[model samples]
Target: LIEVEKPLYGVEVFVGETAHFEIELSEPDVHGQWKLKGQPLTASPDCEIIEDGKKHILILHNCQLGMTGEVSFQAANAKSAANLKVKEL
Candidate 1:
């Protein structure tokens, strides 16, 4: 069993500010069985196969205001994963 922590990636946001959330992935690591937040985030074909190997991005705004959640990544043969929290002015 592997323990993946929350907030895989983060950035500094100023007071009364907003931020953008993004998750990134690549082709090599998209394989095998995986789980997210105790639920199956990916498995087998779905786990290892990325329709578009291009950059995957998620948008998050005003997290400090009232927006937060758990992020989990599971990969069989993987290497690179990155997240960004953009500070809005």
Candidate 2:
């Protein structure tokens, strides 16, 4: 059996802190996308997405004060999406 960790819908992190969100998708063949606010999320030194089978992890490292908004994760095959609100203080 595969284990899928539940993702938090909303979270608050202080500046310079690190936050991680884990999203799970049961469909292995489906394509998934992640976004912050309305822009597509890209992999970098501070932000990253790691996928392993059906489990995906979104990490926000060294969280900046401006990186506060609604984050979304969606699966094309599932035709569903999830949102996470990030508050930086």
Candidate 3:
């Protein structure tokens, strides 16, 4: 499992076809919350965080084309940012 130490604001998956993967965050952003980028379709808000003090599992199901091309994790209040690249399996 990969570990990230800051708040990840944006997470993008580069798969156009149907795919399922799990993304886990070790800690929350400055706001003490971690939310997924798939809003509206998301039952919760981007302001959501892991209340259990554990990694949060983000599932991307049946992802559409050009949905999310890049995965970026920004710190709360826009203080910092990190990026992740998804290579085809």
**Which numbered prediction scores highest in TM-score against the true structure?**
2
Spell out the clash pairs found in candidate 2: none
**What is the TM-score (0 to 1) of candidate 2?**
0.66
Q: Per-residue CA lDDT of candidate 1, range 36-85, in tens?
A: 23345432321232323343333333344222233344443342233333
| lDDT to native, each model | 0.35, 0.59, 0.35
Report the poorest 10 consecutive residues by lDDT, candidate 1.
Answer: 42-51
Candidate 2: segments with Cα more than 4 A from true spot: 1-8, 77-89
lDDT of 2 by residue, 1-89 (tens): 22224543566665566666666665464456666765775778557766665566667767665665666666653322344444554
lDDT of 3 by residue, 1-89 (tens): 22554443444455443223223455443222222232223333222223343534334443444343333333333322333333344
List TM-scores for all candidates, in order. Answer: 0.30, 0.66, 0.33
Per-residue error for 43 in candidate 3, Å, reads 3.7
| Clash pairs for candidate 1 | 21-60, 30-48, 31-48
lDDT of 3: 0.35
TM-score ranking from best candidate downward: 2, 3, 1
The number of clashing residue pairs in model 3 is 3
